[PDB]
From TrEMBL, chains A, B, C, D:
The name this protein goes by in its record: 3-oxoacyl-[acyl-carrier-protein] reductase
Keywords, comma-separated and alphabetical: Fatty acid biosynthesis, Fatty acid metabolism, Lipid biosynthesis, Lipid metabolism, NADP, Oxidoreductase
PROSITE patterns assigned: ADH_SHORT
The reaction(s) this protein catalyses: a (3R)-hydroxyacyl-[ACP] + NADP(+) = a 3-oxoacyl-[ACP] + NADPH + H(+)
Protein purpose: Catalyzes the NADPH-dependent reduction of beta-ketoacyl-ACP substrates to beta-hydroxyacyl-ACP products, the first reductive step in the elongation cycle of fatty acid biosynthesis.
Length: 234, 234, 234, 234
């Protein structure tokens, strides 16, 4: 259980972020989900209830980060747990990929982790406790065609986490990555099922479970690690 | 919790095996720890209580495996969870390493996993549920000097688990590995602490936590994975 | 030998880039080394001779890339081989790392690879032959403290290369990474020697050898691979 | 070139072992290929010519190893280069896999490497130069269904090599692994071609090239490494 802990889950509107936010709430956490719109933030608040609050965050905007965090520090307190699930895709072959499509993915999926991690670190070091978890992807390891930007960002996240893990290990702060396989998405056959040995798509809840485990005090000695939830895939 | 589950922990006399056995008992499991001697088995029974039983097992002996399992099936029931923590070391440089020292490690740390995994598989497939977890080591990945046999076995275990994971994924059976770092042992300074970023040795309980998580229904979609608990090391 | 091949080595002024450029020239290549200054470009031309030319390139500047490539296409021809050795470091702990220091490393060490790779790809696909090699680092895999940006970029490079490798494999184009260990640098004891088993620092020539091998027709079936030259380290 | 070098290639009768033996001969090596039968040894001698000799070797038999090596030391000299390509398969699901089928693979593909490596090490350390290369497999890393024994052995080989690499790095001896993908075999469609991005099966020559590169003086700083030749696969 996360009694008295404050967890910040970016992109907590639906799917994995929502599952993670809901599961953390269920186990006594003070969760704070984010969206890119006030509407989504309200939608988040609605299902979070009095246990947490939904806020509008733009991971690419430093100002937004500062503002949202200031709100979090003012209303609730210092962030003990950080879940980076904010991410987008701009798929294209190498040819036909605009600088925009590359840079956006880099800014949203990689640089954001640096910014947000950097923003909450001091309080964690001070408090002698911290959890930084980033939802990565299997294609950050495999990777995948038409996703050079995504694979680059998601590999970069692993590198970042492993590099950071060595930096703040002695201070009871762990930095890890969770890599989902083919999870059940809003979008969703044979191509996906054939790849996975388990013969079934993963559930967001299953990812939330992994994150929740890494977030708990039972994973205090696990850091700079990449946990793969893909049902035998890869 | 593991209500109504039967867990077989090999080498459950002290340290990691004991922690794992104790933690599984604590969460409603019917645990069955093993030793190489009847004395150790009794010692295991003593601390397990009415929740489980300590038995004498020789992983290198097929007859012993059959006997012990027959006892387990007769008294308790089919093994739902299998924890392979039986292992030894015969350290030596490549020169100066007897065929005996190599073969013993191979037989005890690698072939045993095949035998025991093979022994309990049918009931798991039939039952449409199974957990096979092997306690590996960081030197199975790094690895380490004067431990070619140990590293070979412990890498082989990972290969085995990953190969098996693909075989029985569709049947709700997962096969994973847990790799401890420098855990607090009966034997136990700067050399070990310097290597680890966390600045502290891991606890058996922390390993037990990881195993217990992999054993639970919250890791149903994690298979063929190697979870490293080393506090930022490696 | 690289008879009739055109190789573009970024950051070919000294050390590894120079070794790579020199070794490629030695084996019949038409090499084209780059620097950030005209002075360095001249310095490159001086030691390359009539076999190649030194040009001024700014990997972060699209205009510069277009210009330099236009020069290369006009004077010599289409790039058959691409060696990405352009890279910098802005070391700092996570706290105390300016957005500038992060972004510069990301732009120079990661986005550059995307741009340059994208720029030369069409001719390679058309020509049904291509070599894209990026000089990475061991800390992109380990990684290292006070180098989150560097590790992120250098992991991202691996992700990128692996993702791209799947994209253009059928067209006889390979995309790989070379990761040096502690190579003899302009800067350069026990700390470095203790980490390396080989008891000695690597030489730029040794890296050049690896790159040259990957560049040759003997590595036509090696793609999306990361070759580590670190003398038993890691 | 390998002028004045003595190379021992196990299982050098056809395919990859033959390619490796032929390519090493071509570049000035004194090669010594092996078979399990005198017929195969003669067949090897026939195509090797006066540059080398074909001998009968049984990797599972210590006596055979001692004898063959004694012959090699008497006739030619100390082994400078060791290529382990001796290997077999006994495919079966976990259930239905006899102890025999497991143990044979372990003895032939894993323990052999230990024995042969151990046998030639002293001369290499003495001579301050050595090359130990083992032909592994992609399924030692992936791995594969119905091949738990093979995957275990081939992962164990990697562990062994990495463990050994740290042991003898300072003495100018390197221990590496080459992992082929779907190479053109005596046996050999869509299933294999679909898996490989390159859209073609690898050639034994391509593997021989990799081994030859690792064997040469241009890979003196590459040790404990696993080079994957699979044309973008994995």
């Amino acid at each position: 259980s996360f009694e008295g802990k404050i967890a910040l889950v970016t992109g907590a509107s639906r799917g994995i972020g929502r599952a993670i936010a809901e599961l953390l709430v269920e186990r006594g956490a003070c969760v704070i989900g984010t969206a890119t719109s006030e509407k989504g933030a309200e939608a988040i608040s609605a299902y979070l209830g009095e246990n947490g609050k939904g806020l509008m965050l733009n991971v690419v905007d430093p100002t937004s980060i500062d503002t949202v965090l200031a709100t979090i520090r003012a209303e609730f307190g210092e962030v003990d747990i950080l879940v980076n699930n904010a991410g987008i895709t701009r798929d294209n072959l190498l040819m036909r990929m605009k600088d925009d499509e590359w840079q956006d993915i880099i800014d949203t999926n990689l640089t954001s982790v640096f910014r947000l991690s950097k923003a909450v670190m001091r309080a964690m070091m001070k408090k002698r406790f911290g959890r930084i978890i980033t939802i990565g992807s299997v294609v950050g390891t495999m990777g995948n065609a038409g996703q050079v930007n995504y694979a680059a960002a998601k590999a970069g996240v692993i590198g970042f986490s492993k590099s950071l893990a060595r930096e703040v290990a002695s201070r009871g702060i762990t930095v890890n990555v969770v890599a989902p396989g083919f999870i059940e998405t809003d979008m969703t056959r044979a191509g996906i099922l054939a790849q996975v040995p388990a013969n079934r798509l993963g559930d967001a809840k299953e990812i939330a479970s992994a994150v929740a485990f890494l977030a708990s005090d039972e994973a205090s000695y696990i850091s700079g690690e990449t946990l793969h939830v893909n049902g035998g895939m890869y």
